[PDB]
Coordinates of C-alpha atoms in Angstrom, one line a residue:
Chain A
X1 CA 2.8 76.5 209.8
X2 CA 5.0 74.5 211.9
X3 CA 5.2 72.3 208.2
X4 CA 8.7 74.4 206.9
X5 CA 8.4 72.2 203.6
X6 CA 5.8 73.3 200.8
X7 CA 5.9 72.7 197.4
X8 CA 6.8 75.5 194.6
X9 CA 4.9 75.9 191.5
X10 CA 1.5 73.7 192.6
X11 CA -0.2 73.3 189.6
X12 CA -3.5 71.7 191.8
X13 CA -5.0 70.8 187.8
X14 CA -2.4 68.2 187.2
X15 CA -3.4 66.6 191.0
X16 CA -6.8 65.7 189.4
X17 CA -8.2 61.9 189.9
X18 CA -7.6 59.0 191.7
X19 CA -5.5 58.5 195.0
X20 CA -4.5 56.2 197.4
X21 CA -3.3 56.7 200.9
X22 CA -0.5 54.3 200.9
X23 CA 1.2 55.7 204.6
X24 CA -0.2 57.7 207.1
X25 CA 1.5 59.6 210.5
X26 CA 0.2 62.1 212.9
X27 CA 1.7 63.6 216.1
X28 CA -0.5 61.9 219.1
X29 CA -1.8 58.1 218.8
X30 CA -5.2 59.1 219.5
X31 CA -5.2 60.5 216.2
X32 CA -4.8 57.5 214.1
X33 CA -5.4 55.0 216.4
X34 CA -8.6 52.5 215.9
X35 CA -10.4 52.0 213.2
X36 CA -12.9 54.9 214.3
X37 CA -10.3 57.1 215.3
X38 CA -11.4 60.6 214.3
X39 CA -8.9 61.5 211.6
X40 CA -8.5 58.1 210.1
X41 CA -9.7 59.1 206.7
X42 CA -8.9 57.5 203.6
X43 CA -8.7 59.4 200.0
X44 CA -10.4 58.5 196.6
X45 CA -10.2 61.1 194.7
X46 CA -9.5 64.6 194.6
X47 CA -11.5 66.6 192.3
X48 CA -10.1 71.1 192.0
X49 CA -12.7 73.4 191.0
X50 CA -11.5 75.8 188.1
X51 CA -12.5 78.2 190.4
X52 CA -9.7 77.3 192.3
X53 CA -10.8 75.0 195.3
X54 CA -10.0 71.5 195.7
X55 CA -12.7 69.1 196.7
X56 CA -11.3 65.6 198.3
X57 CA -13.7 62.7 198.1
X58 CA -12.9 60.1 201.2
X59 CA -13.7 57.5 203.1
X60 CA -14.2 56.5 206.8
X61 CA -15.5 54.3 209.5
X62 CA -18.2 56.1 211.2
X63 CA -20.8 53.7 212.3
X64 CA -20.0 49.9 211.2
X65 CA -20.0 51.4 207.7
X66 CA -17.2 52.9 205.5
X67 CA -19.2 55.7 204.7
X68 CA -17.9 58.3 201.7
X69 CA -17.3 62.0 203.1
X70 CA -17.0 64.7 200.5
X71 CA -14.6 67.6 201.9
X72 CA -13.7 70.9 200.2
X73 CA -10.7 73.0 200.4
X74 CA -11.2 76.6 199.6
X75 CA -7.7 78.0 198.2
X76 CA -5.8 80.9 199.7
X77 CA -3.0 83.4 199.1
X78 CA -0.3 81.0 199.0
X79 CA -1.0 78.4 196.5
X80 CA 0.0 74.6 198.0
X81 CA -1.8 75.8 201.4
X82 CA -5.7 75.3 202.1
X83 CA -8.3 76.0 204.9
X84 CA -10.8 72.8 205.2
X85 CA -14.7 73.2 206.1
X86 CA -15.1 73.3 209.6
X87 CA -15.1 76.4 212.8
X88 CA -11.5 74.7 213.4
X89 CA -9.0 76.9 211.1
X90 CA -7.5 73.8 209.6
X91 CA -5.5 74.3 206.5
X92 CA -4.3 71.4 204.2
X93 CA -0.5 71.5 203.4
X94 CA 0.9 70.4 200.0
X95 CA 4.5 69.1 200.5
X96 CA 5.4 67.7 197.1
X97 CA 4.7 65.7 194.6
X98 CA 5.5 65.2 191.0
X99 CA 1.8 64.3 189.5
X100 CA 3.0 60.9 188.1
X101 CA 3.2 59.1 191.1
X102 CA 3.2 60.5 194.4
X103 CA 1.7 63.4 196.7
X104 CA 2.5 64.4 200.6
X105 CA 0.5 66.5 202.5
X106 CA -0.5 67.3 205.9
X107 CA -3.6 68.6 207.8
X108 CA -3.4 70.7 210.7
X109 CA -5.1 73.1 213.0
X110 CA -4.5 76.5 213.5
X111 CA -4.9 76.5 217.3
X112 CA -3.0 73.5 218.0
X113 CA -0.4 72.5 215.9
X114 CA 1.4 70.0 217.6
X115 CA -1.7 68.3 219.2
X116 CA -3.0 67.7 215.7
X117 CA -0.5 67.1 212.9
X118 CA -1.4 64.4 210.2
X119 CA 0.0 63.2 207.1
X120 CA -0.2 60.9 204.4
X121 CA 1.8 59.5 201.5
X122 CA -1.1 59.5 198.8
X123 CA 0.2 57.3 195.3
X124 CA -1.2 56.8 191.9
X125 CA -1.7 52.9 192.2
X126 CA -1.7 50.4 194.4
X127 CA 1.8 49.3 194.4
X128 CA 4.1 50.0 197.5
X129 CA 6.6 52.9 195.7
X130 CA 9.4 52.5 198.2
X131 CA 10.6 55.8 196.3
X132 CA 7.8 58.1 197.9
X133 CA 7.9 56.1 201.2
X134 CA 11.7 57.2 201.5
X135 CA 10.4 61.2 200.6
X136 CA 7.5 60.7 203.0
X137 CA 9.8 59.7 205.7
X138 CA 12.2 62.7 205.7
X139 CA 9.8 64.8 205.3
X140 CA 8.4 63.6 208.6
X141 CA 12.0 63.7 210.2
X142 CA 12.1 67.3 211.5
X143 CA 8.0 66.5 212.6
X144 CA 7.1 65.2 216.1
X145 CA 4.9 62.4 214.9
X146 CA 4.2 59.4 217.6
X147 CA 2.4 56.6 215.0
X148 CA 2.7 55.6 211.6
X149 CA 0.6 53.7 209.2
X150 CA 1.3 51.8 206.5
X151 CA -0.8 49.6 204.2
X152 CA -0.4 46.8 201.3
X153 CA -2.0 46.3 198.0
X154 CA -4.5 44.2 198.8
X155 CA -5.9 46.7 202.0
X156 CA -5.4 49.7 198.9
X157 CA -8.0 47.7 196.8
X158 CA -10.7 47.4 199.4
X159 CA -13.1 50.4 201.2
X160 CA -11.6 52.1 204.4
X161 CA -8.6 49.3 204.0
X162 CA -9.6 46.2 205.6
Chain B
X1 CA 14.5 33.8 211.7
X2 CA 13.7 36.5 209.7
X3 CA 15.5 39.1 211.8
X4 CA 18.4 38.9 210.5
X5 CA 20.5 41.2 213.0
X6 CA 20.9 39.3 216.5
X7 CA 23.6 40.7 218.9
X8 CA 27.0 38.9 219.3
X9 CA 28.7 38.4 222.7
X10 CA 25.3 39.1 225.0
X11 CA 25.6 39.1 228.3
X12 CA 22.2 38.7 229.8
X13 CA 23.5 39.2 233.2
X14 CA 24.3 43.0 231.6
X15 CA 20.8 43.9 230.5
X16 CA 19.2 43.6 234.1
X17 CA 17.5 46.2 235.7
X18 CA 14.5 48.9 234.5
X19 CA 13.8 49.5 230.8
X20 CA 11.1 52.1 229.2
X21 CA 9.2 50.6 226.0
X22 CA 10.4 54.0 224.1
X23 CA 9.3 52.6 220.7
X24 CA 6.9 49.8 219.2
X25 CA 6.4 48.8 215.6
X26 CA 5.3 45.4 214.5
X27 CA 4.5 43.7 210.9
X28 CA 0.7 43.7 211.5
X29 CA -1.8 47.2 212.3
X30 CA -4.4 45.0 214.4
X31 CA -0.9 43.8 216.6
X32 CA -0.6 46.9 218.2
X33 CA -3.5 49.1 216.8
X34 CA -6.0 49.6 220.4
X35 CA -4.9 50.0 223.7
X36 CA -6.1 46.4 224.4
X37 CA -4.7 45.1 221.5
X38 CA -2.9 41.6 221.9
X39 CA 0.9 42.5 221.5
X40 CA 0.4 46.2 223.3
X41 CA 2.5 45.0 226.3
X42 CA 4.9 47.4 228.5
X43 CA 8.4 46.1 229.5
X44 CA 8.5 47.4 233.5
X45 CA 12.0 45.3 233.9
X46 CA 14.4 42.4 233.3
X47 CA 15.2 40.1 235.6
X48 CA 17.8 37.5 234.6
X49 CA 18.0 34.0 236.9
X50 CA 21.4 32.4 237.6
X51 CA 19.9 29.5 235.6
X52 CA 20.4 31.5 232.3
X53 CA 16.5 31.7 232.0
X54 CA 14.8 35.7 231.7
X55 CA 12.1 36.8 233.5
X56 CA 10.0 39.4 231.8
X57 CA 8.4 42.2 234.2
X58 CA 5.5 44.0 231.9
X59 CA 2.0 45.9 231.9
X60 CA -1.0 45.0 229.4
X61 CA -4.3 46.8 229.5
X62 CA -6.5 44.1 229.7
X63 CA -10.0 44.5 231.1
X64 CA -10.0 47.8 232.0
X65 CA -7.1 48.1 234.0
X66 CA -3.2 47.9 233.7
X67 CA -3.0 44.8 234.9
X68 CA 1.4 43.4 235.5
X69 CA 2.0 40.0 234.0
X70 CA 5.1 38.0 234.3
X71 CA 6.6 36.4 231.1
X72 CA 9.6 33.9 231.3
X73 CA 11.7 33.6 228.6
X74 CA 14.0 29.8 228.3
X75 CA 17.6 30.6 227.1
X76 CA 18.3 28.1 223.7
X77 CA 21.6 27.0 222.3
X78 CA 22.1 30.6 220.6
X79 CA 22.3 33.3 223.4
X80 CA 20.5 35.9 221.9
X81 CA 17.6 33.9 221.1
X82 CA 14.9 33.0 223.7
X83 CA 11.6 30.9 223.6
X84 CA 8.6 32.3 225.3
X85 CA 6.2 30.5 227.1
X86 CA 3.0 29.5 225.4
X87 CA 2.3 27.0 223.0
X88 CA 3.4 29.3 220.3
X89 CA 7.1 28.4 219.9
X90 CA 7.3 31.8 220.4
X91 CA 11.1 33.7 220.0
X92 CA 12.6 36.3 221.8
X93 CA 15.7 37.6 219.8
X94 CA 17.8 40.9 220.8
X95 CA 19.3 42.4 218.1
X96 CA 21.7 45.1 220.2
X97 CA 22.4 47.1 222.8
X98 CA 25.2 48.7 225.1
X99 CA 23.6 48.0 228.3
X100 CA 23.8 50.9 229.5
X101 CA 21.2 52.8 227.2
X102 CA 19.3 51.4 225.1
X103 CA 18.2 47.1 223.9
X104 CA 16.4 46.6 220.7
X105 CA 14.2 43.2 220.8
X106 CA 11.9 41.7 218.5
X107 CA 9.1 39.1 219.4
X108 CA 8.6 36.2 216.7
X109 CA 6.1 33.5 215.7
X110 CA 8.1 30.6 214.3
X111 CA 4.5 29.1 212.6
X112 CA 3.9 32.7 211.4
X113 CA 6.8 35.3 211.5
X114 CA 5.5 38.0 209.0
X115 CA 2.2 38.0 210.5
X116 CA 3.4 37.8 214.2
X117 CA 6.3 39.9 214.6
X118 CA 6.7 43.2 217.4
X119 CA 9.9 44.5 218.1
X120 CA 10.1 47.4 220.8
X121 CA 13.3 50.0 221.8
X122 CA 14.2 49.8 225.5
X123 CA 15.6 52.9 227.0
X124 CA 17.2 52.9 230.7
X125 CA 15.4 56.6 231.8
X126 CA 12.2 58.4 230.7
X127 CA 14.5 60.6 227.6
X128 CA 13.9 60.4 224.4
X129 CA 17.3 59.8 222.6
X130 CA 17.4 59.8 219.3
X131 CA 20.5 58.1 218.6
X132 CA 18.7 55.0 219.9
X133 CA 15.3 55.4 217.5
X134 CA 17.7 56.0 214.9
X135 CA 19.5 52.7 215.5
X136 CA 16.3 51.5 215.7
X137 CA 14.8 52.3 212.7
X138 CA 18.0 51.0 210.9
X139 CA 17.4 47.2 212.5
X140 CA 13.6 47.9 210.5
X141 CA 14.8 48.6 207.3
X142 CA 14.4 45.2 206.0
X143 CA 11.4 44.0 208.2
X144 CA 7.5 44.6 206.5
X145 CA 6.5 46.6 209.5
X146 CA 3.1 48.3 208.7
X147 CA 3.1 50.3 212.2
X148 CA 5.5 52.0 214.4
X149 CA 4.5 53.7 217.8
X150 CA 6.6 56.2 219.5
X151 CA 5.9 57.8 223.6
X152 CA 7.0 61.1 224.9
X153 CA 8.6 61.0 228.5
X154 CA 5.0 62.1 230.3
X155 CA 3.6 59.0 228.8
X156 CA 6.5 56.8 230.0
X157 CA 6.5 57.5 233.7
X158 CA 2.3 56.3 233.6
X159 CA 1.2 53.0 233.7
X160 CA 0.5 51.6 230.5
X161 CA 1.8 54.8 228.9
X162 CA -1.3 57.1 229.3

């Protein structure tokens, strides 16, 4: 909750199909830092149930594979919030976006806020938009975020961005 | 050469003394990705010699300790720009500072600059200032950085920030 900026009016139909996580940020470097660090995941696609949920296909580096993880967000009272799939209360924060291009959100848990904070800068295509880079950013001003990742084009195109 | 910002009127007799790697970003994830990664060095402090030379106090994790290495770095014809010690016609270039707070510098690879350059934000105590990380982040406007590190005072006062 510690994420004061939400987006108004989410229609989560028009978020439907293909993503890619262009930036990515989170409070402590453990976070995001290897390759296998815990929440380096990287979005396909996200798929909403008309019953209201939002399933988010992604990938990761588990093993020495980039295996494909299916999560699913189950919708609550306020409409850009969601709890994720797991004993930890972790709800998935929708910041804006504007369906065309661009889409920021955050994960975070419940219990502790600070200690786990991550967000991304999710775009249509793989081009570097230096217009949702610049929203991303001041979005993350007011957030005590510690790393940031950023990739190019050619990491976009390939699995888990190598 | 790419850093086009270098600081005017340096007096490297002026920037002696202890300095806290506050900030890290660098044009490459793998530069400064792991704890053991290659460029993940931590500037203890900087002893100029009455030769115009500057010796380079710092911490790298290599094996599996914090092991303190010892860099020297040759003045050249520009005073703001240095040449490190390997092979590598490596380039030390400082774009600013007021001595008293705060030095940005950036680390260069004449053969390869966009896929060898780290630049870091020196403090003089263990605070976070912000007016420092902003001026900072204004020097890395132009610069394809793809990673950016930030520590919190608790982390700065360990070796090897841990």
């Amino acid at each position: 909750l510690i994420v004061t900026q939400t987006m108004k009016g989410l229609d989560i139909q028009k978020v439907a199909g293909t993503w890619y996580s262009l930036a990515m940020a989170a409070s402590d470097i453990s976070l995001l830092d290897a390759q296998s660090a815990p929440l380096r995941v990287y979005v396909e696609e996200l798929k909403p149930t008309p019953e209201g949920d939002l399933e988010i296909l992604l990938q990761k580096w588990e093993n020495d594979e980039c295996a494909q993880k299916k999560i699913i967000a189950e919708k609550t009272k306020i409409p850009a919030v969601f709890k994720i799939d797991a004993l930890n209360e972790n709800k998935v924060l929708v910041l804006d976006t504007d369906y065309k291009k661009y889409l920021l959100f955050c994960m975070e848990n419940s219990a502790e806020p600070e200690q786990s904070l991550v967000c991304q800068c999710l775009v249509r295509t793989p081009e570097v938009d230096d217009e949702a880079l610049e929203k991303f950013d001041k979005a993350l001003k007011a957030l005590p975020m510690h790393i940031r990742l950023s990739f190019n084009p050619t990491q976009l195109e390939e699995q888990c961005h190598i």
